Amino acid sequence: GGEARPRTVWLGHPEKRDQRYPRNVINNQKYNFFTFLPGVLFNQFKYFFNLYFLLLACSQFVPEMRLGALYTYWVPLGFVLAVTVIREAVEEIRCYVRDKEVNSQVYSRLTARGTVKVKSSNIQVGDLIIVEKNQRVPADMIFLRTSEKNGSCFLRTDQLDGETDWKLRLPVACTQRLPTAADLLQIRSYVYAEEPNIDIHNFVGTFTREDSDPPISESLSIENTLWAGTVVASGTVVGVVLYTGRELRSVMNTSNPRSKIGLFDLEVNCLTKILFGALVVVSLVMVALQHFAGRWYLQIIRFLLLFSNIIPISLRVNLDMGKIVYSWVIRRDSKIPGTVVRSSTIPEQLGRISYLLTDKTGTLTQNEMIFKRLHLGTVAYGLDSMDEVQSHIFSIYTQQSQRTMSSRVHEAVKAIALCHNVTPVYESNGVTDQAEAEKQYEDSCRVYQASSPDEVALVQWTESVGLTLVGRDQSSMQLRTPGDQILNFTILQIFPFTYESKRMGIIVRDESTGEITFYMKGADVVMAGIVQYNDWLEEECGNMAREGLRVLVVAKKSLAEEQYQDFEARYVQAKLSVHDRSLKVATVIESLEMEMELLCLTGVEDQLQADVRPTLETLRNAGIKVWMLTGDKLETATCTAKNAHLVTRNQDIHVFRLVTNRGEAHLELNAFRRKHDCALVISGDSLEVCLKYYEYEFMELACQCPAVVCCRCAPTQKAQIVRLLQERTGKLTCAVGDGGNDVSMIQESDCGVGVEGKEGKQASLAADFSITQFKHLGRLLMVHGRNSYKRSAALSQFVIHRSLCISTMQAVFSSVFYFASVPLYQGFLIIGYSTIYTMFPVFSLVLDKDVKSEVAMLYPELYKDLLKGRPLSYKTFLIWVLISIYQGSTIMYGALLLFESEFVHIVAISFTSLILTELLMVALTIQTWHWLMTVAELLSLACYIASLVFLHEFIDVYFIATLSFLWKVSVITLVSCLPLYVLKYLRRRFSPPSYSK
């Protein structure tokens, strides 16, 4: 609402404030109570198709421009308006209802009298909120206090930025050292924070405690923050709220909900202007026939009003009820269960998607990593050979009290169990205490915690193999053997993992034998020169990486009691330096990283969701280009692309390097252009430079690519890529995601599909369609999307044909019969009333199918036909227009020739010959017959014969029931329908359709 300013937030006291802060509520609604009606009415009557019916009714207030009754212009308009309002109201109420699950979650609040329970929507700035383990963070907070004695916590942020790594956060130093949690309320402290912005990974703030005799000021960064939408992984934490509601970092990265219109609806709207333009041209030309005769304008509007049914109100009604049937079918399909249709007015856009932009974390992957392959050079182990590694480990320790391949397996497993940064955590199961399970090393209470999920998966595998990690401190590790002996190790030097070095190291001392070993693990690129000569490391790493695995190289070096002293006494010297510490310390570490004994290669896989590989292949065979836009790091994203077969096994990958300016971006864009059939991997930082200077050049090069992978993408960058694809290509795009960082790109895309996340529902709540699994996307496109697009095209073009045949008939009647009369207008409406006996059979076109659901799934090439716009184009429209003119002329001119006796005897043959003609045309169009199509065509015949019997006795119209009436009606129908009943038969022979084979 206003320019954001910095705020001073006092601990407790949600009343010492300057401005007023927004409610901590999440809203996905388009309108509130006040803006509902103006918004719904304006979004409807701003299109020529809907505004046309409103101007017709308003013209009737003028007495000189009045024609017909007044309830024939407003009752159809009122019924149409009464469906848009009810349909829009139902959508808003359920959006409100589905927003109540997140907004009504119960948390705890520290008050002066004790902890009380608060709802998420009632949380205020300055409140002290308690968030427990595995719970969502309700608002943006500053980490104040934790219940653990390690003084930190881990955060899962996959629903905020799409990163698989856990984030370590630390509390404010003063608040963590207080004896009691309630002590935070008896101190005079405030937090000075920057104005709300969009940056998720940056924060500037200050913590000040006035009470202490020496005032204390701490600088705060992202390490002290707990943003909303994250999940606490360990223990209960206490924080103070800074931002609520629309000022949340997640919400500030989200756009406002909008009302979407489909491309199909934009094309029917264009056809109505052509139909209206043709009618006006006739009116303007017809008044030139008289060379103008005074008050010429009174005749044009009268002519326009009389032939106003060239655009029928049944086009709006039939399309509205058709879309109701499509959403009913999608909500009830048992082969894609759990699908919710939120935007029920665009089901036909699912059948013309050209670009599919998808998230990686949580959409394609299960967010679960597992150890898969161990390679010792001379032998490899997989999930089916892990029962032999357990025997090698058991053999050594069963023979401890009682080289070979058993001693080569043991050396590799012991290295994986020591070279990491994983700390075991014990928690009270309810009978056993945290202080008792720690002593006895119970397995059911143990949890492994680390920043890297890969390290946790490695440690979880050694436990299942025989070597368990039961304890860890800052200077000690404890391992349990198959014979339940505890091995104690002393951590002497640890070198943590950095994304620049891409490797990790540790030095340990065995307290049983006294030996000192140096362990190092890292990527194959950096560890190739560190290890001794071999002939299998580079070969097998490429084979491992080509399977979508994450490969680490493990090495060893035994140090004596003299080389460590030459290192320890030299490593400390570099630390106590004040000039260039980074390069001084580094040169001492790389002096130890030479001639290391290679041990093994480990492969870790991030598990895909069910049927991800077949689904991606099906979409690619349908002509849909798939891009992966993820907020995760480059290395993890490339592994998932190869694992999911987004990039083919033989495909070549070009990795875009870090460009920082206009000059560097031009060089790298020319380098990529010189490649052929290459997949593009580019980071968000390099993408910002490329889109700034070479937006056209970059976009054209990426659209010829087989696949494009964008990593470390901000939520605004994902929506920017979607917008440029729409502008530069003019084709529909689809966006699939599961987290809160994909809401921006789902709202921007033409068709937004949200996958229901495991720890969040924000993307599912903001999408047009919500699915529970990624594999449900294939059937939602090739079956439901294709049928909706094909049924709408056939149904809309038949209503237009029916209204154009009537207009042609009532133009021959108005000239070739009388050229002027008052009784004509009575027959003018009788002909137009013939659409009552075709009301049901034409609507039964929503039941039609060309192929079966098991055939559209097996042959994705049927989908590329819809991408060309074949169902509705200018060719199909023109053919339908020519048939309408031919059929209307044949019925009317055949009525005035076969029996030109009287007016009553002429509206009896033409009205009959038109119902039969339209009933026969529906039977011609239907490809697959349903049993409801049969009763619809046979009930309409019955109520027409019945209506020709009741009026037969009352009105003296015995002319109907004879033999003379029979042959003239039969002849006219045969001349009308049969020529179009033979061309279709010839079409099958000469030009068969692909779905027929």
Ligand X SMILES: CCCCCCCCCCCCCCCCCC(=O)OC[C@H](COP(=O)(O)OC[C@H](N)C(=O)O)OC(=O)CCCCCCCCCCCCCCCCC
Ligand Y SMILES: CC(C)CCC[C@@H](C)[C@H]1CC[C@H]2[C@@H]3CC=C4C[C@@H](O)CC[C@]4(C)[C@H]3CC[C@]12C
Shortest-Cβ-distance residue relative to ligand X? 78
**Is 361 labelled a binding residue?**
yes
**Is 877 labelled a binding residue?**
no
- Residues lying near ligand X in the complex (CB under 6 A): 56, 68, 72-76, 78-79, 82, 308-309, 312-314, 317-318, 321, 829, 832, 835, 839-840, 843
Per-residue b or e along 611-622, where b marks 16 or more CB atoms closer than 10 Å to that residue's CB: ebeebbebbbeb
Q: Which of 6, 35, 37, 51 binds ligand PCW (CB under 6 A)?
A: 51
Beginning with the edge strand found earlier in the chain, give each strand of the sheet holding 153-156 in spatial order: 167-169, 153-156, 231-232
Q: Which of 567, 566, 556 is nearest to 594 (CA)?
A: 556
Q: Provide, rounded to whole angstroms, the least separation between the CB of residue 833 and ligand X.
A: 6
Shortest-Cβ-distance residue relative to ligand PCW? 277
Q: Is 250 in the site for ligand ALF (CB under 6 A)?
A: no
Q: Is 790 in the site for ligand PCW (CB under 6 A)?
A: no
Q: Is 773 in the site for ligand PCW (CB under 6 A)?
A: no
Angle separating helix axes 71-98 and 313-332, nearest 10 degrees? 30
Q: DSSP of 390-455, one letter per residue? A: HHHHHHHHHSS----HHHHHHHHHHHHTTSS--EEEE---SSS-HHHHHHHT-STTEEEE-S-HHH
**Is 742 labelled a binding residue?**
yes
Query: What is the Cα–Cα distance from 241 to 7, expressed in whole angstroms?
Result: 12
Residue 73 interacting partner from ligand X, ligand ALF, ligand Y, none (CB closer than 5 to 8 Å by kind): ligand X
Per-residue b or e along 638-648, where b marks 16 or more CB atoms closer than 10 Å to that residue's CB: bbbbbbbbbbe
Query: What is the Cα–Cα distance from 161 to 168, expressed in whole angstroms?
Result: 15
Both tokens assigned to 699:
């976009």
User: What is the residue type of 275?
Assistant: L
Q: Which residue among 99, 359, 750, 768 is the active-site one?
A: 359
For ligand Y, give the closer residue by CB, 328 or 929.
Answer: 929
Q: Is 359 in the site for ligand ALF (CB under 6 A)?
A: yes
Residue 629, helix vs strand vs coil: strand
Q: Is 453 in the site for ligand ALF (CB under 6 A)?
A: no
For ligand X, give the closer residue by CB, 164 or 309.
Answer: 309
Residue 934 interacting partner from ligand Y, ligand ALF, Mg ion, none (CB closer than 5 to 8 Å by kind): ligand Y
User: What is the contact mask toward ligand ALF in residues 591 to 630, using x (rule: CB under 6 A)?
Assistant: ---------------------------------------x
Residue 381, helix vs strand vs coil: strand
**Is 550 labelled a binding residue?**
yes
**Is 741 labelled a binding residue?**
yes
Preceding residues of all breaks in the chain (C to N beyond 2.5 angstroms)? Answer: 402
Residue 523 interacting partner from Mg ion, ligand PCW, ligand Y, none (CB closer than 5 to 8 Å by kind): none
Tally of CB atoms within 10 A around 789 = 23
Both tokens assigned to 914:
């038109």
The DSSP secondary-structure symbol of 813 reads H
Q: Is 491 in the site for ligand PCW (CB under 6 A)?
A: no
Residue 196 interacting partner from Mg ion, ligand X, ligand Y, none (CB closer than 5 to 8 Å by kind): none
Q: Is 803 in the site for ligand ALF (CB under 6 A)?
A: no
Could you give the C-alpha distances from 436 to 442, 447, 460, 463, 845, in angstroms and in order?
9, 15, 22, 21, 71
Size of the site for ligand ALF (CB under 6 A): 12
Q: Of 31-39, 157-165, 649-657, 918-926, which part binds ligand Y (CB under 6 A)?
A: 918-926
Q: Which of 91, 165, 247, 359 binds Mg ion (CB under 5 A)?
A: 359
Number of alpha carbons in the 13 Å side-chain half-sphere of residue 968: 25
Contact 228, 139 (CB under 8 A): yes
Q: Is 941 in the site for ligand Y (CB under 6 A)?
A: yes
State yes or no: is 677 an active-site residue.
Answer: no
Residue 632 interacting partner from ligand ALF, Mg ion, ligand PCW, none (CB closer than 5 to 8 Å by kind): ligand ALF
User: What is the residue type of 882?
Assistant: L
Tally of CB atoms within 10 A around 440 = 10
Per-residue b or e along 864-878, where b marks 16 or more CB atoms closer than 10 Å to that residue's CB: ebbbebebbeeeebe
Q: Of 236-244, 425-433, 792-800, 928-936, which part binds ligand PCW (CB under 6 A)?
A: 928-936
Q: What is the 3-state secondary structure (H, E, C) of 561-622?
A: CCHHHHHHHHHHHHHCCCCCHHHHHHHHHCCCCCCEEEEEEEEEEEEECCCHHHHHHHHHHC
Query: What is the Cα–Cα distance from 550 to 943, expressed in whole angstroms?
Result: 71
**Is 738 labelled a binding residue?**
yes
Cα separation of the two ends of the chain: 61
Residue 835 interacting partner from ligand X, ligand PCW, Mg ion, none (CB closer than 5 to 8 Å by kind): ligand X
- Please state whether beta strands 625-629 and 708-711 pair in parallel, antiparallel, or not at all (unpaired): parallel
Size of the site for ligand PCW (CB under 6 A): 47
Q: Is 937 in the site for ligand Y (CB under 6 A)?
A: yes
**Is 211 labelled a binding residue?**
no
Q: Provide, rounded to whole angstroms, the least separation between the CB of residue 877 and ligand X.
A: 20
Residue 982 interacting partner from ligand Y, ligand ALF, ligand PCW, none (CB closer than 5 to 8 Å by kind): none
Q: Catalogue the E-assigned strands of 159-270.
A: 167-169, 189-193, 205-209, 216-220, 225-226, 231-232, 237-243
Contact 231, 759 (CB under 8 A): yes
Considering only residues 54 to 73 of the shown chain, the ones binding ligand PCW according to CB under 6 A are: 54-56, 58-59
In sequence order, the β-bridge partners of residue 106 are: 119
Query: What is the Cα–Cα distance from 384 to 405, expressed in whole angstroms?
Result: 18
453: Cβ contacts below 8 Å, ≥ 6 apart: 164, 165, 166, 369
Q: Is 362 in the site for Mg ion (CB under 5 A)?
A: yes
**Is 384 labelled a binding residue?**
no
Residue 277 interacting partner from ligand PCW, ligand ALF, Mg ion, none (CB closer than 5 to 8 Å by kind): ligand PCW
Considering only residues 734 to 753 of the shown chain, the ones binding Mg ion according to CB under 5 A are: 738-739
Q: Is 739 in the site for ligand ALF (CB under 6 A)?
A: yes
User: What is the residue type of 249?
Assistant: R
Q: Provide, rounded to whole angstroms, the least separation between the CB of residue 361 and Mg ion.
A: 4
Both tokens assigned to 503:
């490797």
Q: Of 33-41, 518-526, 738-746, 807-815, which part binds ligand ALF (CB under 6 A)?
A: 738-746
Residue 75 interacting partner from ligand X, ligand PCW, Mg ion, none (CB closer than 5 to 8 Å by kind): ligand X
Distance of CA 656 to the CA centre of its chain: 26
Q: Which of 88, 127, 438, 632 binds ligand ALF (CB under 6 A)?
A: 632
Shortest-Cβ-distance residue relative to ligand ALF? 162
Both tokens assigned to 237:
């934490």
Both tokens assigned to 444:
């059911």
Residue 273 interacting partner from ligand PCW, ligand Y, ligand ALF, none (CB closer than 5 to 8 Å by kind): ligand PCW
Q: Is 573 in the site for ligand Y (CB under 6 A)?
A: no
Q: Which of 45, 694, 817, 959 binds ligand PCW (CB under 6 A)?
A: 45
Q: Which of 95, 263, 305, 920 binds ligand Y (CB under 6 A)?
A: 920
Query: What is the Cα–Cα distance from 273 to 270, expressed in whole angstroms?
Result: 5
CA-based angle 267:273:277, to the nearest 5?
150
Q: Provide, rounded to whole angstroms, the least separation between the CB of residue 710 and ligand ALF.
A: 9
Q: Is 636 in the site for ligand ALF (CB under 6 A)?
A: no
H or E element at residue 7: strand 7-10
**Is 497 labelled a binding residue?**
yes
Q: Is 77 in the site for ligand Y (CB under 6 A)?
A: no
Q: Provide, rounded to whole angstroms, the least separation between the CB of residue 857 and ligand Y.
A: 23
For Mg ion, give the closer residue by CB, 323 or 360.
Answer: 360
Q: Is 668 in the site for ligand Y (CB under 6 A)?
A: no
Q: Which of 600, 635, 103, 703 is nearest to 377 (CA)?
A: 600
For ligand X, give the closer residue by CB, 55 or 594.
Answer: 55
Q: Which residues are at the interface with ligand Y (CB under 6 A)?
A: 919-920, 923, 929, 934, 937-938, 941
Applying CB under 5 A, the residues found at the interface with Mg ion are 162, 359, 361-362, 738-739
What is the set of active-site residues? 359
Residue ranges at the known binding site for ATP: 359-361, 455, 497, 502, 521, 550, 630-632, 712, 718, 741-742
